[PDB]
Design a protein around this nucleic acid. Sequence first.
RNA 1: AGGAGGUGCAUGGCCGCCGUCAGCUCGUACCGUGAGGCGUCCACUUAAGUGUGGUAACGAGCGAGACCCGCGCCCCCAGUUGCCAGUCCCUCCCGCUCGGGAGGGAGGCACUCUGGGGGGACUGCCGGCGAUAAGCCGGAGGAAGGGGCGGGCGACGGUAGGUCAGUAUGCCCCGAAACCCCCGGGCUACACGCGCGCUACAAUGGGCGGGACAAUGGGACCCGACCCCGAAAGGGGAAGGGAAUCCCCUAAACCCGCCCUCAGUUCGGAUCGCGGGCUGCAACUCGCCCGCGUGAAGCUGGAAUCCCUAGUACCCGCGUGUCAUCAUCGCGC
Lengths: 214, 55, 149, 195, 64, 99, 68, 135
Amino acid sequence: AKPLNERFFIPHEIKVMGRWSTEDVEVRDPSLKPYINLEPRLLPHTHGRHAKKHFGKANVHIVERLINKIMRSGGSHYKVAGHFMRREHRSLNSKKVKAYEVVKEAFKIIEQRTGKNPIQVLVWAIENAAPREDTTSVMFGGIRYHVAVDISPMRRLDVALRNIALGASAKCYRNKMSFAEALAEEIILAANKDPKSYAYSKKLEIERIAESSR
Amino acid sequence: AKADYNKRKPRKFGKGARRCIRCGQYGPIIRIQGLMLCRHCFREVAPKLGFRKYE
Amino acid sequence: ATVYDVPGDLLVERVAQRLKEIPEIKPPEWAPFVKTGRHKERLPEQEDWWYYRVASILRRVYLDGPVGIERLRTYYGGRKNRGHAPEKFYKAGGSIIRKALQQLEAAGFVEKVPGKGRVITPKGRSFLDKIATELKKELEEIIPELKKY
Amino acid sequence: AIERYFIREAVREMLIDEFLEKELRRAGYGGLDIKKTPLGTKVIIFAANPGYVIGRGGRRIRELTRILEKQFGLENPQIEVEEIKNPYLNAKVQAVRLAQALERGIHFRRAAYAALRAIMNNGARGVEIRLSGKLTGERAKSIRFYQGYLAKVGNPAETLVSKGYAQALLKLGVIGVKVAIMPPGARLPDEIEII
Amino acid sequence: GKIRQGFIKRVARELVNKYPNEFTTDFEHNKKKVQELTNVTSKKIRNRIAGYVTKLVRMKMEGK
Amino acid sequence: KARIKIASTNVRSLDEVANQIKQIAERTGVRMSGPIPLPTKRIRITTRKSPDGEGSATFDRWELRVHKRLIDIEADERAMRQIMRIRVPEDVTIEIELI
Amino acid sequence: PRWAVNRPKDYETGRDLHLITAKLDMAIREDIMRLRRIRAYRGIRHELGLPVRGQRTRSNFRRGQTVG
Amino acid sequence: MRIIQTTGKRKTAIARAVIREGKGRVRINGKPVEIIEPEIARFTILEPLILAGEEIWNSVDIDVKVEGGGFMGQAEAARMAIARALVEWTGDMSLKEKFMKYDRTMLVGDPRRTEPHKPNRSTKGPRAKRQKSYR
RNA sequence: AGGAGGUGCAUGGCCGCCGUCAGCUCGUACCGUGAGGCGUCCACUUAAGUGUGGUAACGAGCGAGACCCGCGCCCCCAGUUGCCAGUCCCUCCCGCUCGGGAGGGAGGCACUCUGGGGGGACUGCCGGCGAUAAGCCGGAGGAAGGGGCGGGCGACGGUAGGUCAGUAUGCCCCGAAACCCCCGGGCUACACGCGCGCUACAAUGGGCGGGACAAUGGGACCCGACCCCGAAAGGGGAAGGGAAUCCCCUAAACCCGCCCUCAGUUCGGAUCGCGGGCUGCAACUCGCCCGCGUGAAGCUGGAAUCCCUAGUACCCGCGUGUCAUCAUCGCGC
Ligand SMILES: [Zn+2]
C-alpha cells in the first residue's frame, strides 16, 4: 500500500515530522501568540515532563498537544452530539503511535485539500475556535449570581483543542469516515469559520451565553 | 467394639491433607516454603521466625 | 549483505516465494483443513501459507539458532478470544513446526544439534544471505542511505 | 533450595520455645539457645529457678531431653540450664511473674505497682504495664501503669523496647498482662550530646 | 513544612556557644566541624545541624 | 581449587566470616578470589491482618533476607586445613566444594 | 478429515456424518427426545428450559419479569 | 583506534553504545537505524545525529546494544547513549549547549520509574481502587 | 475425655472506624466554695499541640517529627554461576571480499550487573515578602529544591463495632449424645431485587500471513530444555537444575501486507448437539481443555453515582497465593 520511500522516510532537517516547517506560520492573535509553541522540533513527543511544572504546557509543541488531545476515547461522563462515545478496549487511550499516525495522515489530507501549510490551517482553526468570554457563579452575600468572566489564553487554547478533538471524534463515530478524515474536515471547517464545525459552534454558543449573562 | 473404626483415612491431597502444626486448622495453610502454618499463626510467629517488615 | 540488513517481512515473503521451487518443501496432506494454533479462529487465507510458515521458521532458525519445537511454538502462539473470559496467551501447535523443520532438514538447510536443537547449515546460510543481498540491492535505489551499509 | 533449611530450623526452634514455655511456666522460663556440634546439639535454657527445671534427681531434665530428641526431631541433644541475665529487664519473665501473682490472689493494683517499682529500682529507662480483663466487676476494663520514658511508635520503639505478654486464668476468666520495658543505656536518635 | 526541629536548634545553639571560633559561614567547614565535634550518626541530622549553625553564625556576623 | 559458599541471615556475620577467610588467606599465602556477593534472596509473604472478614482488608508484607557470598581459594594443605578450622557461627551455613 | 464433520460418531449407524438444515434439526431433536425418553438429568433440564451444562441460576439466566 | 563507550538508561531499558571513526554506519542491535520501525522510534533514535550534523554523522560509526524495556524505552536509551557518545567524541561545548537547549533528557537521564502497587485493587495500580458501593 | 453446641452484652489476643486526625496528660505554682480552669490562650507560620513573639505561668511525657526499608546520580572494593567493549586463533556466509556479518575458543571485567562501604540535598547561596524572627514565593547551579519520591511504624481512649467458626478462656449445655469415623446427598436449587467485575454493542475495528521489545516471582513424588508421535487438547522417552549455572520464558497492546466497508454484519459470543482428552479412588448432580456445528440479548445507556494530580489515570499482558485438576479473584510485576 504505502510506498517504500514513505514507509522508511529518513529526515535530514529539524522540522515538524520531518516534512513541514513552522518558520512561515503566523499567529495574529496577541492573546494566544505566547502560548502556541512553534519552536523547531522534529519529533513531537516529550513523554510528559510538563505536567509537574505550573504553566509547563506553554513549552510544548502545538502538534504534540493536538496528539495528546486526540489520544482519548471521546466521551465518558458528558455527551458529544447527544451521545456517549465510551470506547474501552478499542480506544486510542495511551496509544501515542496511533495518535501520531492519525495526526500525520490528517495533516497530509489538509495540505492536499487546502494547498497551504497544515500547521497554518491548524493555527487558524484554533484562533477561530478559541472563545473569548464565559460565565461562572460568584457567591456574594448569602447567595450566588451568574456573571460573565474573561478567559485566560491557557484555557482558551485548552478549550479550542479539546473541542476540535471532540468534533473529530463525533464526526468519525460509527460512520464510514475515518478518524484522520474527520479530524481534517473539522480543522478545515473551523479554519473556514463554517458553523458545521463542532468547535466553532461551541465557541458561538459559549459567547452567546456569556453575552446573555453579562 | 472395633478399633478399625474411629480412624481417619489417609489423604494425599485436599484441604484435609494439611493441618497447621500449631492449630490443626484445615483452612488457610501457608505452604510457601514448607511452613505449614495458619495465616493467623504466621502473623504471630513471624518476628520469632525472623521475618521483618521492610518495604 | 546479511539478514540483519533487510526488513524481516520482505525477506520472509521473498524466501517463501523462492522456496516453492524446492521439491522437499511440500505441504502435508492435512494442511488445507487445519489451523495454525489453538488461539486462532479461522483457517489461513493464503492457500500457500505452508511456504510462508516454512520461510519464517527458517529465518528464525538462522537468527536464534539453535532453537527447538517448544520455543518455536511459544514464538508462534498469541492472544486468544475466550468469549466472556479475559484474553490470555496460548502456545501454537507442534505438528506444523515439526514437519517444517523435518522438511528443511531434508532440503539440507538445517541440521540437528543433539540436546540443543536445530542450527542452520552453511548451505542454508548462503541461501538466506543471497536473497538478503538481492533485497538490499533492490532497496538501495529507493533508500540511498542504505548504500553505506 | 537453601532457604528451606533456615525456615525449618526457625520453625523447629519456635516449636521448642513454645513447648518449653508451656511446660516450665513455674520455673520463670526466659528463653533458650540452640547450638550445633559435630556430635549433636546443645540447648541452654535461661531460667530464674533452675531447681524446678532440673527437678529432684534430674527426672524432669532427662524427660525433657527424651522429648526434645523424639518429638522435635533434634539429634543427640544435651540440655543445660543457666540464670537470667536480668529478670527485671526480661519483659516476658516479668509478665509471667505478674500473671502468677494475679493467679495467687494479690490485688491487681498492688501487684502491678509492686512489679513497676521493682523494675524501676533495678534499673530501667521506662516501664509500662497494661492489665485487661474482668477487673472489679463483670464488665471488662483495661488499666495501664507507666513510669519513666518509653517509646511506642517507630523503629526505636520496635527495637530497643522489650515486650512480654501473659495470660492469668482466675476463677472468672483470663486477664491479659502486657509489659514493656526500656533497658538502660538505650539512646534515642534525638539524644545528641557535644563531645 | 521545613520547620527546624527543637532538638536540632538546641544542639546548634549549644555548639555555637561552646565553640564560638570553630564555626564559620562556610557550610562545608561547619558540617565537617559538627561531625568532628558531636556524636551525630545520621547524615540528614548532621546536615541540618550544620545548616542551622551556619545561619546562626551569619546572624551573629551581621549583628542581630 | 576450593569453592566456599557462605549464606546467612545477617550481613555482619557474613562479613565477619568473609574477613576471617580473607585474613586467613593473607597470612596463609594463597591466591584467593575476592568475596563475590550473590543476589540476595528475599522471601516475601503477604498476609491479611484481621482474623475475621469484617472491616477494610489490610495486609502486611513479612520479609526474610538471605545473603550469599562465594570465595575461590587455590588448594593447599595448610590453607584448606585452616579453612576447615573456621569458627562457622550459628547463623552462617558454609559449603566447601573441590574442583 | 473425520474430525471435522457434524456427527463424528452417529448414535445408530456409528459412521462419520455431516448433516445440514432439516437433517441437522431432526438429529438434534432426536437426541433431545432420546434424553427425555430415558429420563436423564439433561432431559429434565431440556424439558424445564433451565441451563443444562451445570451453571449457577441464582443471579443469572433470568428470563421472566419482575415479581413482587 | 579511539573507541569510546557510553551508557543510557530509561525505565528498565539499558543501552551500551560504542563509538569510533567510521563512515556513518549506525546500528542498533545489529540492525541499521534506517530500517527501524516504527517511524516514531526511528525518529527518536535519529534525532541526536540530525542535531549534530551531516558531517559528524557521516564521519563516525556507532554500535548500540539495548536490553530490557519496551520498543520506546529502548529507543530513548539508545538516543541518550548516542548523544552522550557524540558529545564525548567531538568535545564540542557548543554542541553540548545545543543538545541541552533542545532536550535536557538526552544528556541527563530520566529518573522516573514505576510506582509500586498498593492494596485495594493492587493489580490495577498504586492509586486505582475498587468502586464504592455506599448501599 | 471430647464439642466448628449457645453466650464477642462475661473475656484475653488481633483487626476495621473516628484517624497519620493532632491530639492526650504530668510536677510545682496560681484562680475558683466546688465541679473545674491555667499551662493546652492570642498574632503570624506549618502537613503537624510544627515553630517565632506576647502572656499566671514556669518546666516536661506519649504522639507528630525523629526513626527503618526501597528508587534516582557519583566514588572505592569485589569478578562467579554474572558481563563481552578492545587484542589473538579457528570455522562459516555475503556484493568475491577493498569491506561487512555470525558462531566457538582461549582471554579480559573495560561497560552493564550483582552486594558491602562512602559521597551528595542541608532553605546551602541570590532577589523579594513577612518584623530583622518563625516562615513563604521566585531564581542560579544541580541526577535529585524545599517532608527529594513511594512505603513500614496507628498515641491516651471510645466505638457493648467483628471474631468463642484460628488458637486460649469463665459459666451454661450434650456427654453415649451435640463426642469420633465412614458411604451418599447439600453448601452449586431459582418467578425475582441488589453490590463488585468480565465480555461487548464495532472502522479510535474483525479475520488471515508476517515483523519486534519486558519485569516481578517459582521449581523434588517439582520446573522440565531436546527428540519423536498427533489437526488441537494431549501422549512416549529424556539432558540439565536444591538454582546469577537448567527450566517456567521468543507476552500482549504495537508495526507491515491482504479481505471485509457501516451491516445485528466476516460485529457480539451467551445457549445448545456430536465427538476427542487431563487430573483424581470417584467428574451425573458438580471439574477443566480442544475440533466441527447452531448462533440469544446487545447498535452508546434516565434519575443517580465511583476512582484518579506524574510514570499517576486509561489501555495491554505476565508472575505468584489458593492448587491432584480448576482464576473473570487477592497480592505484585
Ligand atoms: Zn494455626
